[PDB]
Amino acid sequence: NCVADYSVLYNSASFSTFKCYGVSPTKLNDLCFTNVYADSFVIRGDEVRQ
Amino acid sequence: IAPGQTGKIADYNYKLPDDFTGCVIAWNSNNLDSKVGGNYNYLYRLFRK
């Protein structure tokens, strides 16, 4: 029930890929999904691909 | 500079389509430049609308 505001990832830098989307990426929008399972933690940082 | 990218520099700062299947050479190495006396001649064009 939020504004979404897909103005990140393409923003700043670093980050990771997605590999889990549909078609026409951009700021996603259009389809606004159903849930946001926001998970937070800290990793060693070298793994990344793990 | 790769397919699927959506960063501002990808299109906002500098326009470069990600569907190219040829060859684009955009390296990153100071080497020759080595300009320590305020090398501001190369603009950025951050303000894009």
C-alpha–C-alpha distance, residues A11 and A24, integer Å: 18
The separation between CA A22 and the C-alpha centre of its own chain, rounded to angstroms, equals 13
C-alpha–C-alpha distance, residues A15 and A8, integer Å: 10
The closest of B38, B5, B39 to B19, measured between CA atoms, is B5
Interchain CB contact of B8 with A (< 8 Å): yes
Q: Is the dihedral of CA A20, A22, A25, A28 positive or negative?
A: negative
The closest of B13, B24, B11, B21 to B47, measured between CA atoms, is B13
CA angle centred on B45, ends B24 and B43, rounded to 5°: 80
State this model's resolution in angstroms. Answer: 3.8
Q: What approach was used to elucidate this structure?
A: cryo-EM
Flag if A26 and B8 touch (Cβ within 8 Å): no
| Class of residue B39 by CB neighbours under 10 A (exposed 0-12, middle 13-18, buried 19+) | exposed
B27: Cβ contacts below 8 Å, ≥ 6 apart: none
Contact B6, B15 (CB under 8 A): no
